[PDB]
Amino acid sequence: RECISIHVGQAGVQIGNACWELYCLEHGIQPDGHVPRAVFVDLEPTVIDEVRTGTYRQLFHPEQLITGKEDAANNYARGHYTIGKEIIDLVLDRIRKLADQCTGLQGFSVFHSFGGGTGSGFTSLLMERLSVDYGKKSKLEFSIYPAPQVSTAVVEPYNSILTTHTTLEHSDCAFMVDNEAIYDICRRNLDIERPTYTNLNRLIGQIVSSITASLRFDGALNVDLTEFQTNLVPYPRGHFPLATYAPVISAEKAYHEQLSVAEITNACFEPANQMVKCDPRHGKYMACCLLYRGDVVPKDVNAAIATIKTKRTIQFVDWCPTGFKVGINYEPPTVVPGGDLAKVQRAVCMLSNTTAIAEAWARLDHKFDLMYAKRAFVHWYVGEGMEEGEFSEAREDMAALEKDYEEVGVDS
Template sequence: MPSDKQTQDDTSFSTFFSETGAGRHVPRAVMVDLEPTVIDEIRTGTYKQLFHPEQLITGKEDAANNYARGHYTIGKEIIDLVLDRVRRLSDNCSGLQGFLIFHSFGGGTGSGFTSLLMERLSVDYGKKSKLEFSIYPAPQVSTAVVEPYNSILTTHTTLEHSDCAFMVDNEAIYDICRRNLDVERPSYTNLNRLISQVVSSITASLRFDGALNVDLTEFQTNLVPYPRIHFPLATYSPVISAEKVIVVSLFS
């Protein structure tokens, strides 16, 4: 007989992973990009064995930092395939609570295609919660001059079709890496690891037993005062480098 702790660990693990017939655990995730470069890094990288190939979806050309291309033209060619993959994953869930959506506000795919996806999810899964983790552009760390336009256009969809949105500011993440982690030139790996720590903390209540925010609906109930004002501020501390941890442990 498995112990209570073992049963709890198995349950918490299966929240975000499903077990295949071969006994492998696969993330309940679909990764989408309108051009293949970034997702090809996953296909050939360290974690290529972790994801099912059907869950990594790419188009042939990117949205060129253009909201309209991501929403109305290039994005429309791939949306049905994405929704089919989402449907397959949701059919494998014993109790689907909702969706966690990770995207940027500044890019053409992150703004335009995500807006289209959220609109379609609202139609197909009307009562299911949608939580966003969004990367908001900053003037000091900008890759395209049209980022403000993309952000404004996708914010409308965020207001209407998202239940709770956690914003991450690009510039703030860079500053934390430089100031707190002593990383002079932060890479995307540094930024993503920092963001993943915050996301892990936010979703811990979904994966482990607790009294608060035990499902996605409770996030909205506890954090959102009014449906359209659903942008809680995420704070996380302490953020210190490994070297500082060693120094503190030596003198404590």
């Protein structure tokens, strides 16, 4: 029934504090109410401390807040092997101590930031140690994969080609939200050149609320977590769909809010609104899980979608007749009291697997080579319990992820 969550890496923790905020906010549980149902991991104390100093301070147990005073290191190796190792046990312990206390759970919603040290590496083995300790569950990892041109870390790819290959054979469904492609939404669909990280977080903090929160919440067309991976992954590769939200209108500027279904659903497939720089440049969808929430008439959907199924310029895979999982919830969304999110009475958090990422992975793989081609910051990992193996052998890994996402599509 439940779904634990492990927010790993400063980012996964910032986003965590955010997604965790939106929660109580739409459940009437102020600062000090019940008890969360997740954990927080980081090898840099000062960040988890922000959850220990700032807002939502006492809504957590100093037990579900793991820290390694030591060093973060923007390098996979160190975070996965060398350092990150020391903490893992302890980490697990909570996701085994928190996993027990419950009643027939469904899985762990993992929150990490692909291209980091504590986020890429660590998790790599966290999800790793999970796939074995609970192979019998769902492993949906919600990632924030590398901005297409606006990356931060100098190594980023090293850290992301490595978190992909190690987690690939362990996740159930990996959700993806592109940090940059979300900015566009903040520039083009909300207008603000002042987007603090605290915003992107409010956003995913939204799209995510549509996943677990409301879905695990009764409705006219419930959709379990398992449901996802089933209706969402055509193949064992921990396939990565993309998150998209519909009413991303500004709560100040424009106001047409009352945008009946027929509209908000069409607003999902236009590439300028998908929290991912993977513009459907060719990527044929192969399965979409349209999660609606608020006042929505099933016919409105079983029509708004029909209209789409016949737009053709939206070309769905061949081997897939119908790939539209319609998830209907009741309670409308719940916008921050005064952030910058419109606040409509219905939304569409549609996520999907698109042959599109054939790109995004490509463009991120290429990156890697360029540097590896010169070993660039390699000495930083080797000296951290890794080898020419793990790199070269994780490169070959993704290679067959560029062929995979190619074969499962583009062909009939």
